[PDB]
Design an enzyme around this catalytic site. Structure first.
Site, mmCIF file in Angstrom:
data_model
loop_
_atom_site.group_PDB
_atom_site.id
_atom_site.type_symbol
_atom_site.label_atom_id
_atom_site.label_comp_id
_atom_site.label_asym_id
_atom_site.label_seq_id
_atom_site.Cartn_x
_atom_site.Cartn_y
_atom_site.Cartn_z
ATOM 1 C CG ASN A 47 -1.909 1.031 1.395
ATOM 2 O OD1 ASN A 47 -2.274 1.796 2.426
ATOM 3 N ND2 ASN A 47 -2.381 1.426 -0.005
ATOM 4 C CE1 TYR A 79 -3.441 11.041 1.964
ATOM 5 C CE2 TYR A 79 -5.111 9.457 1.794
ATOM 6 C CZ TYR A 79 -4.140 9.822 2.421
ATOM 7 O OH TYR A 79 -3.653 9.105 3.573
ATOM 8 C CD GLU A 177 -4.517 4.963 -1.264
ATOM 9 O OE1 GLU A 177 -4.772 6.150 -0.832
ATOM 10 O OE2 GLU A 177 -5.122 3.765 -0.750
#
Length: 191
Positions: A47, A79, A177
């Site tokens: 991640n 984000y 991401e």
């Protein structure tokens, strides 16, 4: 010459704040280019979230351009984070094989697009304050796009109207991401 980041870090490059975070070091890198530009590339990552933007988020009108080539699960989104209350937020412009979802909260129409609003909870997960349990607010575009303007205030207000309250702002970036996937991206932000 361009600085390439591969370990959890925040700093500044060519006049812009940048953040880089991953739980899978060695599987993703972010390269800082001139102005508000950056690139990333990843292979078999766990991640990660990375991007350029600002140390302190707010109601900016962000303009960006990007090439987003994910091979699996990935997001391209404005984000950020807030404290008191602790909230991780997303304004998703594009995604990979998985469109983010959560408890449905309505929709918001802004910048020539319609976004669905969702709320999710992260339990015992990494956060800006360490391992905490916190809410995630999302504005997800109904159709993907990789360039345009994001009138942040409109999303913030819609969230507020839906019962999703934000606290004091920490950073805010046009992030790439990735989750259990590979891929690459190049993004240029402005305001």
């Amino acid at each position: 010459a361009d600085t390439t980041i591969t370990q959890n870090q925040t700093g500044y490059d060519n006049g812009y704040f940048y953040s880089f975070w991953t739980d899978a070091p060695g599987t993703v890198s972010m390269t800082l280019h001139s102005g508000g530009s950056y690139s990333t590339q990843w292979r078999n990552t766990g991640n990660f979230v990375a991007g350029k933007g600002w140390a302190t988020g707010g109601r900016r009108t962000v303009t960006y351009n990007a090439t987003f080539n994910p091979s699996g699960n990935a997001y391209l989104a404005l984000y950020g984070w807030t404290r008191n209350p602790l909230v991780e937020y997303y304004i998703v412009e594009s995604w990979g094989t998985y469109r983010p979802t959560g408890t449905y909260k309505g929709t918001v129409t802004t910048d020539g697009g319609t976004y669905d609003i969702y709320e999710t909870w992260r339990y015992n997960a990494p956060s800006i304050e360490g391992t905490r349990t916190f809410q995630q607010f999302w504005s997800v575009r109904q159709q993907k796009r990789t360039s345009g303007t994001i009138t942040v205030g409109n999303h913030f207000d819609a969230w507020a109207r839906a019962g999703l309250n934000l606290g004091s702002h920490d950073y805010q970036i046009l992030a790439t991401e990735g989750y259990q996937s590979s891929g690459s991206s190049t993004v240029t932000i402005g305001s």
